[PDB]
Structure 1
Amino acid sequence: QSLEESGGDLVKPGASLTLTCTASGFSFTNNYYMCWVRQAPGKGLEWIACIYGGGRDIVFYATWAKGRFTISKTSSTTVTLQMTSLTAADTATYFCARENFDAVGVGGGTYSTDYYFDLWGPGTLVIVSSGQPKAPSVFPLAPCCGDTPSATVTLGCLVKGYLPEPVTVTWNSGTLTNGVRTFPSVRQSSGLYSLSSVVSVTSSSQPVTCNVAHPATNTKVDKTVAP
């Protein structure tokens, strides 16, 4: 059992967008609710909505979502989240989660309570912005050329002005990992993201190459850096 969200994208303010969560290793039944939970960059988890896995149509929404988002089961292994009138405040990673519950009482008179989440997807990233997609510029990071050289040195790549997230950075096609430090991205005033990655290298042991990928614009940049 795993979950996988898809459909995240860069869209403009006012746009709609539909996300999909697909289940593997189990199908939806009356033993679970399927739910969506989001998290804006650097912020907390926000519950959005839950839908009953059984035959009855039972959906619950956060008070801020009902009227603007809709959750549906489109098959025994897929639920969607339709979002309308998006704003920059809806920018977030969106998780699909499975929810366990206790049936309490007796009926038709029985109700669900003791909700908790026992399974999560890796999440899908939604970006709501005025700006259009933009591939990053990659610049070398090295010590001032005026300074006296040195055996041991740290070098890097500045990955600047991309949208949307994410980019990924490896060094020497992944064969260099020790001494690598890649910083979380920052959103600059421009609305564009930037990050840096640096690697500390023993001496003239290697030429080091940073490998930068920006999947949203189908872009990969190799930059060989030297001092």
Structure 2
Amino acid sequence: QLVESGGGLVKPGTSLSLTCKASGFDFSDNYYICWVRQAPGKGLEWIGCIFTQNVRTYYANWAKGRFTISKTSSTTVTLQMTSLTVADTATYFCARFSDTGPDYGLGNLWGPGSLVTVSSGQPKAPSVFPLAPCCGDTPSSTVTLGCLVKGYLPEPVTVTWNSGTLTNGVRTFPSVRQSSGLYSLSSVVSVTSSSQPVTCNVAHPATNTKVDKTVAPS
């Protein structure tokens, strides 16, 4: 499959090299390797493709100036970008377009993408706070508990419960971004009361951080 890497938090005006690495096949065969980005909450935007046979390249007119695609090895294609701004914050997908016979329109192999966050802020690990009903409320037989993952930069964080064994009733919301640019999200889970002491597992890879918070009602 395809795996993008090389991204993360970077300052405006800088430059970046993203790599797309193949496994179980290499670029000695005839494919197109295309780069497609997507700003958060917006549409797909084609950047350019490179043909693996003759390393011929084709760019979107808007992307010619600041973007470059090249085949550095039989298993790696790199996307070089320059003069980054906030408008370049996006997930950068690598996609393989295979031969259908008369054309190469079969783009059925996509990587998960590499997230690039263009900000002048410093990386910041999340502060995890428990979420439980008000102490003064009469408890019920079923209770919803959660964790507030507040003030981290950049995305993403991933949340599990009981190290991945508690998955029924879990609702992990997409992240919000406040004015200062820090991200936050919550994850709640419905469990039987006076029964399960639950623990959220918040991972922030950008700061090499993992936080476990054991939450309990009252």
Indicate whether the TM-score tops 0.5. yes
CA pair 58-30 structure 1, distance change in 2 beyond 3 A: farther
SS in 2 for 1:89: helix
Aligned-pair distance for 1:48? 0.5
2:40 aligned with 1:41: yes
Q: Say whether residues 1:224 and 2:187 are aligned partners.
A: no
Q: CA deviation at 1:98?
A: 0.8
Distance 2:10 2:128 in 1: 25
Q: What is the distance in 2 between the residues matched to 1:25 and 1:223?
A: 39
Q: CA deviation at 1:116?
A: 3.8
- Across the two proteins, how many residue pairs are aligned to each other? 217
Matched residue SS, 2:112:
coil
**DSSP 3-state at the match of 1:22:** strand
Which protein has the larger Cα radius of gyration, Structure 1 or Structure 2? 1
Q: How does 1:16-27 map to 2 (within 5 A)?
A: 16-27=15-26
- 2:180 corresponds to: 190
- Superposition pairs of residues 2-21 of structure 1, within 5 angstroms: 2-21=1-20
Give the unaligned 5+ runs of structure 1: 105-112
* Structure 1 partner of 2:61: 63
TM-score by length of 1: 0.91
CA distance in 1, matches of 2:16, 2:30: 29
User: Residue 31 of structure 2 contacts residue 104 of structure 2 at CA under 8 Å; is this kept in 1?
Assistant: no
1: distance between equivalents of 2:72 and 2:129? 46
Matches within 5 A, 1:1-227: 2-29=1-28, 31-54=30-53, 56-101=54-99, 115-227=105-217
TM superposition outliers: structure 1 runs of 4+ over 4 Å: 101-104
Cα deviation, 1:99-152, whole Å, max 9, x if unaligned, reads: 235786xxxxxxxx5534131111111111111100001111111222222221
Asked whether the 8 Å contact 1:30–1:52 carries over to 2, the reply is no
Matched AA of 2:4: E
Distance in structure 1 (CA, Å) of the matches to 2:105 and 2:142? 55
CA distance in 1, matches of 2:25, 2:145: 47
Equivalents in 1 of 2:55, 2:174: separation in Å? 41
1:37–1:49 Cα contact (<8 Å) kept: yes
> Structure 2, unaligned stretches of length 5 or more?
none
Percent identity of equivalent pairs: 83
Match for 2:203: what amino acid?
A
RMSD, aligned CA: 1.5
- Cα distance in 1 for partners of 2:202, 2:212 equals 6
**Farther-moved stretch of structure 1 (26-35 vs 124-133):** 26-35
Q: Secondary structure at the match of 2:137?
A: coil
Query: Which letter maps to 1:27?
Result: D
| 1:18 shift after superposition | 0.3
Counterpart of 1:107 in structure 2 is: none
